[PDB]
Structure formats: C-alpha cells, structure tokens
C-alpha cells in the first residue's frame, strides 16, 4: 500500500488528519495540549470482514433481512434516503389499498373459478407463486420487491389455503464494504431501524390477522375479502412514521455527548440536569466506534449547533432507537484489539537503530474457491438465473490453483518486499527528512480494482492532500469515503498498541471546537527525529498519528484476513441470485507460441477449452472472477515493477562497485526465482497441458512436413523454458491477471541479465 | 429424460394444478432441455484421428 | 400446451388447481397434435409422446 | 577478492541473519572474478570457488 515520507502531510496529505478532518486546513498545526484522557474497549465497526452472500426471500417476515437488505439500497446510493425508499412503497401500496380490484383481478388467478358462489365454493386452493409473475406483468413494484412486500403479504392471508412455493428463495450477494458507516448512514440505518419498526409494524399485520372469512367448512365469498384487505392496507398505511428524525437527534446526541467529552462546556454545567435523567448514558461513549461519527458532523454539518436541542430531552428513549438499540447494521461491537490485527508492523533502519523505510502491513490470507459456472438464463434476462456450476471442472483447475497461494506466500511477500527494499546504509546513510514508512494495505487496493475503480490519481490527490471532485459523484463519494476508513483502521492499531490518549481540540475556529482528539504516549523508541511533531525531550508522549504506529517493534499480525468464501451454488442455484453478470466473466484466452526450428519459424495457436482438455463444450461459462488475487498480484506485480526502477536507479546512483555489485544478485537471482515459480507452476497439470499439446503440434509441423530432426529442439533449456514460461504466464492471462503487455515488461526482464536458464529443473 | 420429469408439486394431492400455469413451467422446462445441447466433440475427425 | 389443455380436459382453464380432481389421456391428444402438425416429420411426435 | 565476494553474495554491510539467501548456481560469477582475476589456463580458478 501507501508510502510516505514522514515529516509532512501538511503539504502532503491533507487527504488525511484530524485537522484536515476538521477541514481545518493547512498548518503543521498545534495541539495546545490540553485535557482529559480516553480509551475504549470496543469498536462497533460494521464487520471488517463483512462481505456476504445472503440467502434472500421466503416464508413469512424476516424483517431484519428485508430491511437489512433494504439498507443495501439505501446503502447503494441507489436508494438514497430511506425516505425515498418508503415513498415508493406507499406509492404502490396506497395505489393498491384504494382498489379491491387489484385483488379481484388476482382473484381471477386465485381461482379461475373466480367470483361466484359459495364462500367461493368454500372448497379448494393453492398459489404457489405465479400470481406474482402475473403481478409482475401488471407492473406495480415500481421498482421490484415491493413485489416481495406483496409476496409475503398476500400469502399469509391465503394461509391457511393455498399452497405457496416460489423463487423468493434467492440469495443476494452483499459485497465488500466498510466498517465504519457515516452519518446519514447512521441515520438512515436508524430510519431503517424505523424501517424495522415499520417492518415489524406494516409488515406484520394488516391482514395477518384475521377474520374468519376462511373458516372451514367455509372459505370466503369472492371479491369480498378484497375489500377488507384493501382497506386493511389503509390501516397499514395510517400508522406511518417511526422515531423522530434521526438525523438531528443522533447528531444531537453526539454533540450531547460531544458535550461530555469536553472540556469544558458548563452548559447546564456540562451533561447535567439532563444527565440526571440518564443512567443509560454509560455505555454509549465506551466504544471508540461511537465517536467516530462525530467528525462526520464536523465537516458535514460544518460542525452543527446547540447539541441538537436534545431532541428536547427525549428522555431516555431515543438511544433506544439506536442499533445497539435497533440492530440494523453489522456494526460489531468488537474489541479493540481484535478490531483488526491482520496487520503487523515492519520497518527499516540504517543501524539507526530506528527505521526509515518502514513497512507496516496487513496480511491476508488467500486460497482456493475456484468456480466456473454457466450463468443460466432460465428466463429472458431475468435476475432469475441459476448460475450453473460446471462441477469438477473448474475444480480440476482449483487444485492447480491450490499450490499457488501458498507458494505465493504473500505474507512473506511483504516480508520480502521489505527484505529487498533496503539494502544497508548502502544506499544510506542518507536521511534526515520524512523517512519512509510504508503501509502495506492491500485491502483498499484490492477493493478498488475489485471495484474496477481507478481512484489512484485522486489517491494521489490525497497524497498531496488536497483531494477534490469533478465527475461521477457517486463514485466520488465512495472514493472519498473509503479513504476515511483507512486512518480509521489505523487508530485501532494506534490504540492497539498504545491504547492511551487525551482528547483535546483546536480552538481558533467556529462552531467553537476542534475535536477533542488524540494523542498517544509513545516513548518507545528513543531519541529519534521525525518532524516537528516532537521530539519530546527525554520522556515522550506524542500526539499524531502515523508515526506512532511506526513506533513500535514490528510484528506479524494475528489476523488472518483470510478471504471469505461465498455461496449461491449448493442448494441455492435451484433458486437464483441477483446481479452478478459483472461478478462473472466469460471464460477464455487464446494465444500462439512461436519458435524457430532449425532456422524456420513455426507458430501454433492455442485455446482454452481444449487447454483444459475438453473440446469444446457448450460455450456459455462466466466465471467467478478473481477479486482477490488479481489485485494481490497486481500488488505483487507492481511491487516488483517499481523495484526494478529503483534498483536500476540504485545502480545508477551506485557510483562504486560495491554497491553495483550488491545489486547484481539482488537484481538477479530472485528473478529466476520468479521463474522458479513459473516453471514450477508449469509443473502442474495445466502447465503440462500446454506442453504436451504444444510440442506435439510442433512436432508434426516439422516432421509431418519434412525434417524430423528435432526433438531436441524442445529439449534445450532455452526455448523450453521459453515456452514453458510463456505458457505459464499465459495461464495467468486467462487468469486475467497480467496483460500481455505487462508480461512483456517481464519480457523486458529478458535483456537482463541476459544469463538466464542455465541449467534446470 | 428430464426437463419435466422431474417435477414440482403441482400435482400433489389433494391438489392437481392450476390450468395454463404448468405450461409455463414446461415450456420453459423445455428451454432448459434445449440449452444443454452438444454431446462429445465432432466425432468425425476424432475417430479418424484415432484411427 | 394450452390448446392441448383444452384437450386435457374440456373442462379446461378454470379453477381450482384445475379442479384438483380427475384426468386420463390416453393418447389421442397425439392425434390432435398430428392435426396441428408439429413433428415436421413425425416422431418428433414420439418425442412429445413420451414427454 | 573479498570485495568481489562480498557482493557475490550479497551486498555487504549489515549482512547477517537468516535471511533468504538463495545463492545460486554461481556459475557465471566467477568469470567476473576471472576478470578481476587474470585468466590463466582454463580455470583452475573455478575449482577453488567450488571449494
């Protein structure tokens, strides 16, 4: 991940900081000192590893899902506020409520035996869906799933009689996401909690619940119940509106709370008379996560005003609308220490003994799960898709996929990435600037290219600081948002390792405060220079931030950050999952291997299916894509790629032998090692598939054509390896990964050393 | 074999099946029956290939 | 099918689970279908027959 | 010589620790060392390396 020269970001990443966070902008910027301590225990973060495949639709009400799922639109900014979400519903539903007709038409469907006597026969039934799809036809879920609303709703009334059975059974894939929500997020999550309250309310009842207009032997006069129901829905309408406006309130609370962290706000003489109502106050505070919103307000509300009017004292009741008291979001009370930990630290040093090209990294774990599926259009482009596993087959591949992860020892990558980076004080001893500290955080990166997204010029804008906007705002927000998390994650560590602070703010401003904010108390590393941010003679405490996280002894993690595995397959593809077109890609890649045999160039082209070894099946597979590794590799990759620049450069800047010479191997060996990987990954089935295929086809080309004097031609390294490698790389290319272009730079490795390929294997 | 064999429940006693409805299942049931299409590779070459 | 369904029972598309009661073909439908003419060459009829 | 060596593996001054020092087929290197050496007949020189 991200590299920084530690002496500034006040000119180099006001795309970061608490001050920045204030949007107090530009200055090295003091913290007066000035007050009172803190820590927590907790986080409440979303769920750091979250990203889950949720079985979706069915039975009676799982309001939680429904809403939570709702929360996903809302979240999706593709549904803005909950308010927006709701107006639609009403809009269909009330549009529904006002007509017994809608039903009546349906009733024609309920039985084609339709409206005639007696208690509509008082005998027979069964739906099982299907009506739904009729209703789709009629088109009332202005956006869908208002259909679901109707789905569960009628059925129950049916119940007892008919029998249901649908493809409500679904999975929706909720993906990658934050950890820390944000303000409206809170609010709307709360509105979604309002929606829970709704959900428990409209949803649930309004028809459940009951007449007797069913009661055996009878059943129900036809048309009639409609009237009950239609109107039954009217009542369902009439209750309308959950808690008060969360927004202000939460913020109100926050500031209230704000107004508690203090100094020194003897308004009421601080939390006070209002405090005395309280006695529940207690917990709120106690998690760090809780704080985190505040800042949001600061920018957002510019830092609002008057502790939100307390929601006028709403006694003891609005916290009790929270998620800890209306559990809408993943937000996971999680102990600070474990909040993450896949990160260990790592560092440089010149014998300094301090460091200065320093890496704290996050460590993943990544392994198998491979799936090539034929998306099944079982409908005419409808979300209703089975995604059909081509079992074993991918899987044959998965196993070959298998050696790799381990072999690609990323945890070690990063180990290496340091190990490499530095050489001694060679290039040193050459610092008294912002020393590098480098942060190995794939995650975002993973996420963005997993999000397609190419922020990185904006990241650079963070880098300079001043990070700014002119296009696809959605994304922009996201772009911004995502960033937040980072530091956010950071402190956890900061805290983790020094879990001690005083919250102190900056004046010099309106509304009137500048975040009681945090500091830590490092003293760990001794007499050390790193920016005006200190030194702190003898003793050391220290306020801000990154560095401190530098200031520990490096370590390993303890969290695995193993990637999660997902399902909509087993049991579930008998049912669907919705959107994923993107989530998959069509299978394939074809390229041709060219070699010159006794001075005549031969070239043979090859293809996928058969590369599997299988002419030439259905042709209709889209593949679960390589979200993780493509990126991780692009780290790897990239990691490699810069390095040569530096290294070459390092040689250039080497202006004696010893250094150059040091470079040599350092340059060399390891590459072929790369190769070690690559041929190695040739020793697989799949490598072999190429190979076998390969030579043979060649073989005929000379032998079959003329001269047969040639097996050998396979059997000198060079070529051998050449094909092997190429092939090996080729695999990656249908593993997406590289670009032929990018491989080509690896081919630029060809000039170098030019040693290469003596002996094997 | 299959594409309708195989099964719903849209039959299950006491019930039987709403009329028109199953058609839709079936018609489409047949679509799946279509979609699988193509056995081995081209035998011709192959067999000869083998030969 | 729907047309056929008219044949499946002349009691045809009305309720409930299409009565949820009674049946029996025994062919015959087939010969209707012959009428309609879809086994462009025959025995596509059989395909339909067993199916 | 040392110097030469010194690079050969591997870059010198901290040079310590279980690292990962995938030394190699040394192979070529030698010939640098030859260069730095003089070049008497064939290589004795090399043996010595192996030593």
From Swiss-Prot, chain A:
The protein's name in its UniProt record: Major inner protein P1
InterPro entries on file: P1
Alphabetical list of Pfam families matching this protein: P1 (PF20837)
GO molecular function, one term: identical protein binding
Keywords linked to the UniProt accession: Capsid protein, Inner capsid protein, RNA-binding, T=2 icosahedral capsid protein, Transcription, Viral nucleoprotein, Virion
Gene name of the record: P1
Iron keyword on record: no
GO CC annotations on file: T=2 icosahedral viral capsid; viral inner capsid; viral nucleocapsid
